[PDB]
Ligand binder design. Sequence first.
Ligand code: IHP
Ligand code: MG
Ligand code: ZN
Ligand code: ZN
Ligand code: ZN
Lengths: 27, 96, 157, 48, 19, 49
Amino acid sequence: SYNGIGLKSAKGSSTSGHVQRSLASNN
Amino acid sequence: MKLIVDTHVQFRLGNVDAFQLADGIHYILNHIGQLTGIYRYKYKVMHQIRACKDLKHIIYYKFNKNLGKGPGCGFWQPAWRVWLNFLRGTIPLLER
Amino acid sequence: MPRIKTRRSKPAPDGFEKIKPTLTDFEIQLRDAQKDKSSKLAAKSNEQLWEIMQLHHQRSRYIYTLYYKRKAISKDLYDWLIKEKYADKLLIAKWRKTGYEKLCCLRCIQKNETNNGSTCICRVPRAQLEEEARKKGTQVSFHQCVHCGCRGCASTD
Amino acid sequence: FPFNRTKGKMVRAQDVALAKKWFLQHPDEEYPVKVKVSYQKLLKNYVL
Amino acid sequence: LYTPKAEMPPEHLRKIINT
Amino acid sequence: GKALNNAIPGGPKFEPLYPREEEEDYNEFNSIDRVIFRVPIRSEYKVAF
RNA sequence: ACAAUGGAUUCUGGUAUGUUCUAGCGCUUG
RNA sequence: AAGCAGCUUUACAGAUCAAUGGCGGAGGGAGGUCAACAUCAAGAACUGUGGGCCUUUGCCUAUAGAACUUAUAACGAACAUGGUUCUUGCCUUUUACCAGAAC
Ligand SMILES: O=P(O)(O)O[C@H]1[C@H](OP(=O)(O)O)[C@@H](OP(=O)(O)O)[C@H](OP(=O)(O)O)[C@@H](OP(=O)(O)O)[C@H]1OP(=O)(O)O
Ligand SMILES: [Mg+2]
Ligand SMILES: [Zn+2]
Ligand SMILES: [Zn+2]
Ligand SMILES: [Zn+2]
C-alpha cells in the first residue's frame, strides 16, 4: 500500500510506478 | 453495425450454431480495435476499447474456471453495454 | 407471436387447415408484389404500393368475414391469426364501427397526415362528390387516393 | 437487490450491470497480474 | 383530435426499399 | 484515496487532486526529534480516519 | 515476513499550379 | 372467539306504503413500447384557506392537502460525450490526443 513511498502518479514518470519492498533492508 | 448484423444472418442461414453466434458477437465487441479502425478518427474510443479488453479478463477467468483455453465464451452482455454507452455520447457529436 | 414460425410460436388451432389455401394465395401475391418491378414513373411506382395495401385489406376482410360475419372460425383461431399477424387488429377494429364499415385503411382517416385536419377524400361519399361537381359544371376530378389507391370507402356506396 | 424484492419497475437491458459486482469486490490472491489490473482499471471508471 | 399512428403492413416498407 | 493521493491495495490510482504538494515550511513541528515512532501510519489509517 | 505492473493511432508529404480544347450553320447586307 | 343481547347490513314477510331520514344512484371497466400539457433538486425545502399588522408585497396567527424524487443524499440501484478555462502528459505543426480540476 501507498505508505509514503512510490509516485504521485505514473503518467509523467515514463515508468510503470511498480514499487516492491527491498528484501535486502531488514535489520 | 454490419459486422454484428451479419452474424445473425449467418446464424439464421443455418451456417452458424447459436453458441457460435454468442461467441461471434462476443468476439466482435472485444476486437473492434482490430476489426474496424474506429480509433483513427475518434481516439477517445480507446477508453471503450480498453474497457472491453478489461471486461474480457474478468469474464474469461470466471468462465474458464476448470476449463481449457478455447474460443467459446459468449457472455457478451458487459461489452455490449460499453458500445451502447459509446453510441450514447456520439449521437450529439455526429449530428453536429 | 412473430410472423416467423419460431419455437416460441404456438401451433395453430383446429380450423386453420380449411382456410390455409385461401391465405396462401394472399401470401404469394404479396411476395410477387414486393418483387422490385423496376418502373421509371412515379405514377406507376406508387400504383405498385397501392396493390400491396389492397392485398392487406383483402386478407383482413377474409378473416373479418370468417369470424364476425359468418362465424365460421372459432375465437381461439381468430386470436391466433391476430397474434401471428395474419389479420390487422386495428383495421378490423374500425370495420366494427358504424361509419367505418368498408374502411379503406387506417392511414386514410388520420387527421394529422393531411394538410387540413381532414380525412382522405376516398372517405367522402361518391354522391356527395357528384353533387359538388354538378354545381361547378364539371365531372368529379377524384379517381384514386394517393395513400393506397382507394376509390371510395364510404359505407353507403 | 433485487432478489429481496418481489415487485419493482422495469429497467433497460443496458441498465442491468451483470459484471459490475465482480470488480466492486476483492478479486483473490490467485488471479494473475494482468487481470488484477483489469479489476483496478474498471474500478477507476466506477469512481469517476 | 389525435388518433395514433396507423401501423402499416411489413410489405409496404419492403417494397419501398426494393424500389 | 483519490483526494489524499493514497492507494488502497486493490483500489484505483489517480492523478494528484492537489499536485502542488512539494511546497513546505521549514519548521520545528514535524521533525524526527519531535515524533515518537511506534506504529507506522499506513495508507489504510489515513483513509479510515 | 513482500502481495503495488504507465503506454498503444489517424490526418496534414515536388509537379504543384495555370491555360486552350465550336461537332451539329439564327433569316439581312456581305 | 362458540353461545345470548346491542349494532351494522342482508334474502327479505312487513309497519308506513305520506311528510320523511340514512347510504348509493343523476353517461363504465380494464388496459396502450399512444399523444399533449404541467411537474421532477430546495432555508429539509410545498400549496390552498381564514384572521391581524404595515401599506399589494412582507410578516405573524389558525387550518386543510401534499403524487413522484432524496440521506453511505438523487428522477437512472444505469452511465456516455462536448465547450471554455487552469494544470500536466505525448513531442515534427494542427486536428485527433494524455488525465486531473473548476464552471
Ligand atoms: O495468449 P495469452 O496470453 O494466453 O492470451 C489469450 C489471448 O488473449 P490475451 O493475449 O489478451 O490474454 C486470446 O485473445 P487473442 O489476442 O488471441 O484474440 C484470448 O482469446 P480470444 O482470442 O478469443 O480473445 C485467450 O483467452 P482463452 O484462451 O481463455 O479463450 C487468452 O488466453 P488466456 O485464457 O490465457 O487469457
Ligand atoms: Mg504552417
Ligand atoms: Zn379509401
Ligand atoms: Zn386508404
Ligand atoms: Zn384514401
